[PDB]
Design a protein around this ligand. Structure first.
Ligand SMILES: Nc1ncnc2c1ncn2[C@@H]1O[C@H](COP(=O)(O)OP(=O)(O)O)[C@@H](O)[C@H]1O
Ligand SMILES: [Mg+2]
Ligand SMILES: [Mg+2]
Lengths: 233, 204
């Protein structure tokens, strides 16, 4: 099976990648404390509550009891408790679910960040070719399988040699084709190179980052960051 | 500070309490977790009873290793504060003015130095606001003080709210002084301007 979001981001960081793993919470009280302690470091910052359930379309979905969205903004730790209280212990309905619901027993609480660009990127083991291949496109919010059927020319594909792995020219070109420029290019290479170090050194089948974004830091420094992660085995 | 900075938060005020660390290793961890919540953020390391900017958890470790167990009374603990974008520096204090026998609120737009120096060279920079201990600070007075410092929009009301919470720490603690140097206008990670107490001192 695939591991949860915040678990994937953690492994990505364990190999030198920048990802917003936030902090998990198995209760709405715990989630409130997380946002509260974070206000000590960045007072006035908003928060984002992300249901931890193995299925896509969380931002699109909704909850039975009236709440809309699996990824919702929160202005205060109290709002974090509200949202979290409606998530933990309830069922979420997304596109991958139809209407059978998925039991949500935990959520992830991360700080609200300003996003400048959103990209798709994944490291897939092309079995037909027996080699890894890197997919990407400048259409973060859309979905990989949706874009593929309607626009496969929207995707950039880069087969990877199993020996040396990524080629610095391959990665530099991919970052350049995605519209990146300046320090974000090398930063994108560093993270993407870390994604392979996660893909290969962990015997993984897929490392999907949707969206891989250009975010601003609290001091407004642009840095590549994985705002979502799925790792299949 | 931790007690005070929490008291402001206890009574409904914004205060960057950061987090204390009793060793360079601990300091490096605090900065690491913050990169899970706001990746790429910088950090500020404060030596507790001086302040250097750090770009990475490893830099924080370096700076902490220079402080803990060294000069500037001995320093045996540091406070790791996320690097927040600070726009304006203000100074604000509440005092039992023995001369007038009533609480008074002093404030200036030069929050980068001791109040002693500002008065001498610039006496126009300070703003006295005598407060009736019973009637307390009146909304009219605090709004007048807010606009006296160059605040507009939600900040004007945002200032009034924090000033009130500070007087409660002064009233409900019977404290002789409540000093906020600096009181900053800060941008949140999403570029929202808010008032925040960046340093606190409570005496008796
Ligand atoms: N920390 C964050 N701050 C602001 N927006 C965020 C943050 N994390 C995620 N988002 C936004 O929320 C959207 C939905 O989250 P995501 O993890 O992609 O869920 P899903 O793709 O399953 O719907 C993302 O596409 C992104 O635009
Ligand atoms: Mg996603
Ligand atoms: Mg910004």
């Amino acid at each position: 099976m695939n591991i949860h979001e915040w678990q994937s981001k953690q492994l990505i960081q364990k190999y030198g990648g920048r990802a917003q793993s936030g902090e998990v919470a198995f209760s709405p009280e715990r989630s409130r404390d997380i946002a509260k302690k974070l206000w000590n470091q960045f007072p006035g910052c908003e928060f984002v509550v992300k249901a931890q359930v193995l299925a896509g379309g969380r931002g699109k979905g909704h909850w039975e009891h009236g709440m809309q969205g699996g990824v919702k903004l929160a202005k205060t730790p109290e709002e974090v408790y509200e949202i979290a209280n409606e998530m933990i212990g309830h069922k979420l309905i997304t596109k991958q679910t139809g209407a059978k619901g998925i039991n949500c027993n935990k959520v992830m609480v991360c700080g609200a960040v300003k996003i400048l660009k959103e990209f798709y990127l994944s490291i897939l083991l092309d079995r037909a070719m027996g080699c890894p291949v890197i997919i990407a496109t400048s259409q973060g919010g859309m979905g990989i399988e949706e874009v593929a059927q309607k626009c496969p020319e929207c995707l950039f594909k880069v087969p990877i040699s199993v020996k040396n792995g990524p080629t610095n020219e391959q990665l530099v070109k991919l970052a350049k084709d995605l519209g990146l420029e300046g320090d974000l290019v090398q930063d994108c290479v560093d993270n993407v190179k870390a994604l392979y170090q996660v893909f290969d050194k962990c015997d993984s089948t897929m490392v999907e980052i949707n969206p891989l974004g250009v975010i601003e830091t609290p001091t407004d420094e642009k840095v590549i960051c994985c705002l979502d992660a799925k790792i299949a085995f």
